[PDB]
Design a binder for this molecule. Structure first.
Ligand SMILES: Nc1nc2c(ncn2[C@@H]2O[C@H](COP(=O)(O)O)[C@@H](O)[C@H]2O)c(=O)[nH]1
Ligand SMILES: Nc1nc2c(ncn2[C@@H]2O[C@H](COP(=O)(O)O)[C@@H](O)[C@H]2O)c(=O)[nH]1
Ligand SMILES: Nc1nc2c(ncn2[C@@H]2O[C@@H]3COP(=O)(O)O[C@H]3[C@H]2O)c(=O)[nH]1
Ligand SMILES: Nc1nc2c(ncn2[C@@H]2O[C@@H]3COP(=O)(O)O[C@H]3[C@H]2O)c(=O)[nH]1
Ligand SMILES: [Mg+2]
Ligand SMILES: [Mg+2]
Ligand SMILES: [Zn+2]
Ligand SMILES: [Zn+2]
Lengths: 771, 41, 771, 41
């Protein structure tokens, strides 16, 4: 027992490897049990699994007491591989049971292939697979008991007691290796995800990033990826020779979706010597990856193929010698297909010889399949990148063609800027800006005869081309062209393009935009509110007033939300006001149309902010929210004893000026109520028609009951609702402005007269329904 | 006769009704009605 | 005997760790029992090491271990363990030093900790320490205390303790390797499932994070966790800033993220894993929400640390719920909170993981797992930002296309100018007239097809106004007798003709005049050329519509210019850039119901007409023409052998490919048909073409800084006739000679080329007289 | 008192055309010249 205890303590100490290789401790235990059993040539068969087929491979051979470990160790270059259906070690690995077979030549499972290879005669052998967690790690072999036959049951008992130590060592190594492979998998996934989410890219760049980043965690000496042509159908003119039969139809390798197997690009990652990347566009069939049929075989079939000793196979013509003259030979190959969401093979990844030189087992199959699966999932980013580029290009084309169509032709300019009829040039606008100013200033109607400064001015006698002329006259009267250097041709063009950008709708046509711009002019000049605003700010407000309803479709923000319009999904709030702002800025983007080109960068930044505040301030919900703040501003400005004190109080604070500008733009929008009864009655008819056709759209397309304002059935209720619009929204804007400056007093007077008429018709309706 | 090779696995990762919880994933008193009357909001 | 029994008991010790389903703490308990018996010490124990927040600590796992003791009574749970930081206690100093510390009197070392001595009421007077150190990590510090028979541990006691600790180190490293394998398996599965669910589709933050977290649920192994998403709005609207700038509302004071945004959890997603496996989502959760009631999620949103807190309700800073969180008896025990981080380091959300499924505090391995999950979510934020960009781009495109189409479409006045129903039928604006009556009223107003030589090859467009071109085009469709056969509405036909006219830009040659002359050539080749006998009336209708719309929106440039300028057309459409644009725009124009001249034919007829349009417009590309000249020549050569016209009709009609090639040749001969016009008309059209090509060359030299080809170059203007002669000798001569062979009726077109060629030679040789 | 010490995010681990190899990632004989002279192609 004393020497048995000493041998047990020696086994306990050699179990404490403290580093090194467990094969050494197992070899020391095997030579121990060899000298104990009166048997020689003990052996270990490691279990591998390739393609899901289990095999056994001899790892230590010719174990002898007092023999050197280096001679007992057989490397994978000389290992003998047996499938589980060959040899009693295969049957043992299948059954996971202890077998003791004497006279093996009588056993139906004994294989003499090893006996023929080695020339050694075996007669009686003991087999017991090492099994842990139902998994079989090694088959241990005791053979040719000397001086005795049949072994013994006590030999099996001591055999089991030492195979407990063997199982300890093998389980420790198995847990270490499974930790290693699972850490490699997790790091591969983390790095591939980091590189995929870095940006949007086409397939080639994204796969190259991912594979190059993960190159260190795949223990392959080299590997490559081949990308197949993704085109599925041909152009009709390239089918024409095929359909005429002038060219024989292509025959050869085809993917399962039926595309031709054309590797349009190969990426080689060489890691054996110098780490080098090769990108081969349109590689020839003589490429060292493609010269063996295996990548093409994966492209036709799509199996994951682990093939050990690949030049010993007969099907695949693997190169038996160096391929880059560098002395690297193919030994083991693992190829996998990358697939689309639709199972379509985009590429084939082929991983060559493992750095350890061992044949690929199910662990490296698992690693490479998870990498390939992640790559096949990553194609969503490529498909999205292509759809981004197509949507961007289509948008830019549609916007350019729109802007070209809407822009005023040179005839439309020459219709107003009659330079040809007065300077006799007719070919080039070589004339100086002073000449264009001088020739144009005759052609505009004088602002006094047109009454353009007056609050009463009615646009019915004027034509729309006369409205354009009057608009350029209004810009001239503010004296903007000389100060900000706004060219006269681009001024006239911009006015005409703004007109044409107003649709032919019943009320939101160019006449409404012109009357709002004229109200902005007359409030600035005759209402004397320009005392708070710089001429730059006056120029920006007048341009915004002319564009405050540009390309108004003829519908309300409620309609856009209810109709789920692209405008409503693009602009979350103030849908049409943000559309008008975006389109006015789009008109100002063209150099041809930029009446603000001759500004400083900070002045445009100012003009753009005034455009934004003014057009979004044409939203009446914003008006209603900010009424109370404007009222507080007016109340604080009323107690000021000096006019110049009031001017100081407003001018020092940008936010008060912005609120007053918003209130001015709302006085301008609803100005028609202040116009004489004739004009008010016509304009109220126009808005009533616009609201009726909105309600017909709501009832017909959206299939909903319209509000009584939108309903044609309440037509005769129009004047009473008009009265309701006169008190809730316009009196305040106009009473507070009359308090702010008495010069806007008559606009409230106009409202007051118009309200009486609107009350009269309601009393006429009171007469009608009561009888 | 080519060696027997492993088929690609897809069922495990093949697997939003199945994911729970995806279905859900200012003026004065007078003004609130009359602003909707004129479509101001 | 002592050696034998010790070796046997250490063998049995090693086998206890092989018992699958056992625990290593049992084996270490047996080892401590043997150690305490051999060493004659009492109250042996071990302290497992942990790391939290990156600082190390120790905690007792087995107290009061004595020989012949119950394992259940000796094992202390993690809820009863005593935690010591490394800076305190002898166990901490042993863990730091990673070496043996033998201290005989606890009062002689400043590292003595009184905490447990007062906690349990035991007195200590002897201490020997050696950490279990493997892989440069400390797993447990083992303690021997209060040697009953001696006042010191001698060096032989140290050596025996070292050997038993080597066996304990073997056991503890086996358990450590199994645990690290489990940790990396969890992390790998977490990443694989998160990647599978992120690439499943492009979606918003909320949906994508809910999918990822709900899939990884089974692998977090926490009893409870949640995610809070912060509001991402950074800037305010000017109208909501106004009260802040004026001062009506005090500035916001409270928690802020490091970017500066207000900490507003706009959505909370709770994953309850303790029971019933319920998920809830709370939009705009109140501050009394059970996750937010403790300051910890808000503290993470403010700071962005990873917070592992053990005994969270025992802390005083964060005011965790000491009682149950809800009606169910769940209480917070441990917590781990981490932020989700944008690409710009912005805190998008905070993920909080509460107590583990078992009672143990969170170790560094769970911190590692949870940080890899939150990093993966912070990377999939790129997919969410891409989705939002996608929706904005799609909406902007659709708006721009609709506004374009509305601008280009002919107004009702331009319809009425051709279809004078109002001034002749005495009808209102609403069209309720019969289709046959509209036919009868229109058919007077078109020019008769026999005057103005509408069927003749001599047709000159110079004496016609463009309004007469529209009328003649509707006349051309009218003689082919398409309106009554295909049921196309007369008003739809007129509007489509007029929008086709305004579609074609005012360029010098690719204006409406070229489109009309090509449509007239298609008509005359069909009727007078007798090629109509090869095609159905539907196919002829497609020929005419494609012949008119072949050049639609041609900007005045060629495909070389599109490629060279990197035009959005060239990036959208790979090959045949301009013809693919013409096809896409003609299909867009046919897509509106109001313009769908093919609305009243069968779906199969529409697919046929669409393929007809594609073939015709792509076959307008002369590179395709040059490619398929040889095939058309083979067709003509095969068709001339036959001595029966019926045989020719049979031969061509039975093969769709031959008809498609003859259609391509028909359209090619139609495009260049101006070369066959009389000399005056040819000279004027060649002048217009040369002007277009000279302005192309001036544009190309100006904006690409490149030399034009000699044909584009304006300096060789007088070289125009020679290059025109080249165009005579290379292109048109083949088409019109092969057509004259194919049908003698097209013979005058070649003959017109034959005269015009003579005139070009008579002015080219005069250039040889100028030099 | 003061809050417990908590770990900082390990941003340093993944903080980061440098990828090697990314830089790169029909008519008759007479018809090759005269077609370009007319800009037909
Ligand atoms: N009831 C009524 N509403 C008006 C009148 N004038 C303008 N509105 C309303 O005020 C809005 C002003 O915004 P705009 O459309 O001019 O940008 C109109 O769209 C319309 O809803 C009016 O005379 N009567
Ligand atoms: N040299 C010359 N080329 C022509 C003439 N007519 C047409 N082409 C060529 O034929 C092309 C027809 O293209 P499309 O008219 O469909 O845009 C023109 O762009 C131009 O290159 C011509 O009279 N002389
Ligand atoms: N040469 C040699 N053969 C061995 C050794 N150990 C086991 N074998 C044998 O290799 C054989 C393989 O197939 P079997 O399972 O039939 O039986 C096995 C043995 O007979 C050894 O150490 N040396
Ligand atoms: N009650 C008890 N105390 C122990 C046991 N093992 C060690 N200790 C002691 O508890 C103390 C904790 O802090 P120290 O490191 O200073 O020193 C340790 C000992 O003196 C044990 O098994 N039971
Ligand atoms: Mg508006
Ligand atoms: Mg063309
Ligand atoms: Zn308006
Ligand atoms: Zn053309």
């Amino acid at each position: 027992q004393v020497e048995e205890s000493a041998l047990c303590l020696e086994l306990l100490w050699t179990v404490q490897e403290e580093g090194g290789t467990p094969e050494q401790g197992v070899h020391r235990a095997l030579q121990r049990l060899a000298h104990l059993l009166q048997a020689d040539r003990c052996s270990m068969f490691l279990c591998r699994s390739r393609n899901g087929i289990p095999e056994v491979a001899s790892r230590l051979l010719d174990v002898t007491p007092t023999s050197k470990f280096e001679d007992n160790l057989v490397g994978p270059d000389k290992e003998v591989v047996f499938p589980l259906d060959i040899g009693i070690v295969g049957w043992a690995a299948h059954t996971k049971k202890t077998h003791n077979v004497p006279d093996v030549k009588k056993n139906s499972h004994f294989s003499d292939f090893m006996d023929k290879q080695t020339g050694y005669v075996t007669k009686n052998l003991l087999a017991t697979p090492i099994v842990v967690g139902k998994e079989v790690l090694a088959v241990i072999m005791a053979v040719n008991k000397v001086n005795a036959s049949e072994f013994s049951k006590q030999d099996e008992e001591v055999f089991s007691k030492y195979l407990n130590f063997v199982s300890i060592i093998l389980r420790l190594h198995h847990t270490s290796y499974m930790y290693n492979i699972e850490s490699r998998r997790s790091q591969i996934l983390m790095w591939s995800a980091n590189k995929v989410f870095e940006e949007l890219t086409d397939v080639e760049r994204q796969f190259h990033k991912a594979l190059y980043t993960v190159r260190s965690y795949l223990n392959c000496e080299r590997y490559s990826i081949g990308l197949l042509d993704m085109t599925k159908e041909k152009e009709f003119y390239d089918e024409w020779p095929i359909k005429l039969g002038e060219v024989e139809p292509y025959k050869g390798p085809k993917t399962p979706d039926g595309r031709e197997v054309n590797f349009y690009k190969i990426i080689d990652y060489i890691l054996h010597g110098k780490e080098e990347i090769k990108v081969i566009p349109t590689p020839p069939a003589d490429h060292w990856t493609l010269i063996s049929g295996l990548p093409t075989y994966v492209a036709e079939n799509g199996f994951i193929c682990n093939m050990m000793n690949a030049p010993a196979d007969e099907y695949f013509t693997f190169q038996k010698g160096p391929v880059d003259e560098t002395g690297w030979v193919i030994k083991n190959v693992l190829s996998l297909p990358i697939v689309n969401k639709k199972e379509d093979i985009v590429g084939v990844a082929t991983f060559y010889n493992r750095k350890d030189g061992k044949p690929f087992d199910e662990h490296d199959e698992y690693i490479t399949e998870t990498l390939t699966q992640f790559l096949g999932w990553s194609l969503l980013n490529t498909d999205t990148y292509d759809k981004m580029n197509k949507l961007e290009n289509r948008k830019d084309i549609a916007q350019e063609m729109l802007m070209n169509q809407t822009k005023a032709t040179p005839e439309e300019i020459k219709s107003i800027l009659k330079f040809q009829e007065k300077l006799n040039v007719d070919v080039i606008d070589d004339c100086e800006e002073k000449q264009l100013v001088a020739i144009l200033k005759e052609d505009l109607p004088d602002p006094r005869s047109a009454e353009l400064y007056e609050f009463r001015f009615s646009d019915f006698p004027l034509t729309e081309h006369g409205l354009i002329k009057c608009g350029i006259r209004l810009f001239f009267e503010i004296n903007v062209v000389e100060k900000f250097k706004v060219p006269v041709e681009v001024l006239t063009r911009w006015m005409y393009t703004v007109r044409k950008g107003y649709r032919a709708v019943t009320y939101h046509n160019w006449r409404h935009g012109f009357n709002v711009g004229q109200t902005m002019f007359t409030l600035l000049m005759t209402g004397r509110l320009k005392k708070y605003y710089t001429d730059l700010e006056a120029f920006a407000m007048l341009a915004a007033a002319f564009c405050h309803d540009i390309d108004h479709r003829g519908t309300n923000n409620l309609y856009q939300m209810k109709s789920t319009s692209p405008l409503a999904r693009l602009h979350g709030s103030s849908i049409l006001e943000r559309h008008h702002l975006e389109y006015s800025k789009t008109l100002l983007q063209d150099e041809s149309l930029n009446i603000f080109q001759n500004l400083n960068k900070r002045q445009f930044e100012t003009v753009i902010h005034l455009f934004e505040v003014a057009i979004i301030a044409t939203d009446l919900a914003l008006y209603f929210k900010k009424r109370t703040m404007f009222q507080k501003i007016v109340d604080a400005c009323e107690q000021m004893q000096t006019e110049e004190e009031a001017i100081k109080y407003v001018t020092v604070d940008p936010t008060k000026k912005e609120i007053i500008m918003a209130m001015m733009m709302t006085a301008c929008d609803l100005s028609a109520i202040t116009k004489p009864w004739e004009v008010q009655s016509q304009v109220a008819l126009m808005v009533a028609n616009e609201f009726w056709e909105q309600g017909d759209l709501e009832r017909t397309v959206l299939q909903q009951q319209p509000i009584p304002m939108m309903d044609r059935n309440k037509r005769d209720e129009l004047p009473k609702l008009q009265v309701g619009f006169i008190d809730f929204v316009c009196t305040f804007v106009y009473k507070e402005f009359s308090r702010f400056h008495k010069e806007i007093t008559p606009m409230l007077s106009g409202l007051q007269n118009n309200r009486v008429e609107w009350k009269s018709l309601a009393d006429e309706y009171d007469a009608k329904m009561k009888v | 006769g080519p060696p027997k090779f492993k088929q690609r696995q897809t069922r495990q990762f093949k697997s939003g009704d199945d994911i729970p919880g995806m279905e859900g994933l200012a003026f004065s008193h007078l003004e609130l009605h009359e602003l909707a009357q004129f479509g101001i909001i």
